[PDB]
Amino acid sequence: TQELANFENFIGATEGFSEIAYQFTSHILTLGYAVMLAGLLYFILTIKNVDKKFQMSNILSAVVMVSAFLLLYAQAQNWTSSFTFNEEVGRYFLDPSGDLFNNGYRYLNWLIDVPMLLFQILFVVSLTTSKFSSVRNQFWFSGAMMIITGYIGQFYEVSNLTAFLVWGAISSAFFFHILWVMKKVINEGKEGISPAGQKILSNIWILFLISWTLYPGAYLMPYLTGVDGFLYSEDGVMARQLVYTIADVSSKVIYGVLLGNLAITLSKN
Numbered sequence: 118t119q120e121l122a123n124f125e126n127f128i129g130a131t132e133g134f135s136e137i138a139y140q141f142t143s144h145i146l147t148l149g150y151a152v153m154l155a156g157l158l159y160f161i162l163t164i165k166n167v168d169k170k171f172q173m174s175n176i177l178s179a180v181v182m183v184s185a186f187l188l189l190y191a192q193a194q195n196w197t198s199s200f201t202f203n204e205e206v207g208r209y210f211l212d213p214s215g216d217l218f219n220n221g222y223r224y225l226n227w228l229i230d231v232p233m234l235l236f237q238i239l240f241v242v243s244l245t246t247s248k249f250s251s252v253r254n255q256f257w258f259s260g261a262m263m264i265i266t267g268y269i270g271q272f273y274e275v276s277n278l279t280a281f282l283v284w285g286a287i288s289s290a291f292f293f294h295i296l297w298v299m300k301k302v303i304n305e306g307k308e309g310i311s312p313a314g315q316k317i318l319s320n321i322w323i324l325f326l327i328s329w330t331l332y333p334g335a336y337l338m339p340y341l342t343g344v345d346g347f348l349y350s351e352d353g354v355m356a357r358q359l360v361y362t363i364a365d366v367s368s369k370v371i372y373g374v375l376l377g378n379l380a381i382t383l384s385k386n
């Protein structure tokens with residue numbers, strides 16, 4: 118029995134991490150929060166560039182950046198605090214005098230950010246036949262549920278793969294519903310805007326679809342080559358944390374930038 122849970126800790130306690138793996142992950146997580154702070158300033162500075170009626174979107178972007186910056190900063194500190202060099206072996210191992218790697222930071226970020234990200238498109242596009250309040254409530258419920266059930270799942274990642282995957286499947290149910298509602302919102306948003314605006318919404322959809330699907334990918338990452346597999350290792354920890362960071366930048370900053378551009382193109386008409 119290996120007291121330690123979560124996958125980063127398990128690897129850290131048994132295998133350890135190479136200098137490369139440890140340093141790379143550290144730098145990736147740092148770039149994570151660096152990009153959010155630059156984003157925060159961007160959304161603040163450019164708020165004036167869009168008409169009053171759209172500005173709640175820029176605002177929500179900014180607030181997402183605040184939470185993303187704070188919690189990803191915490192996550193990065195959590196990484197370097199949690200693993201420590203052994204001279205004998207020449208790898209980084211779980212430090213028992215540290216606090217242990219904790220996914221809580223990222224998952225809290227998700228609980229806060231997912232509702233706002235879904236919400237903020239409703240202040241740029243106009244629905245047609247759907248009700249603002251119906252779409253909102255559906256986003257908020259399914260979003261909360263998606264993150265909550267995921268978080269439950271993630272506890273069993275090492276200890277009970279069955280629970281890990283089942284909770285993850287439930288989570289994916291809510292995910293699918295979100296995709297379905299977002300697609301409706303984007304299709305309705307395309308009616309009665311310039312072709313320029315339609316083109317940007319097409320790109321938002323693609324970005325949204327790819328970026329949000331990275332998260333379940335990273336969730337599953339360690340297991341995507343079986344238990345004997347090359348990913349079931351520091352390389353899976355590396356890839357998971359890399360993909361989470363690519364997702365965060367794309368789902369928050371690039372998403373936000375695209376919505377801003379759409380808002381500007383809408384005023385032009």
Ligand SMILES: *C/C=C(C)/C=C/C=C(C)/C=C/C1=C(C)CCCC1(C)C
Binds near residue numbers: 230268286288
């Ligand atoms: C800015 C952060 C965002 C947009 C986070 C999004 C997170 C997800 C879409 C998570 C989805 C998950 C599943 C669909 C299954 C596995 C558990 C999750 C929470 C990773």
Ligand code: NA
Binds near residue numbers: 197198201202
């Ligand atoms: Na350390």
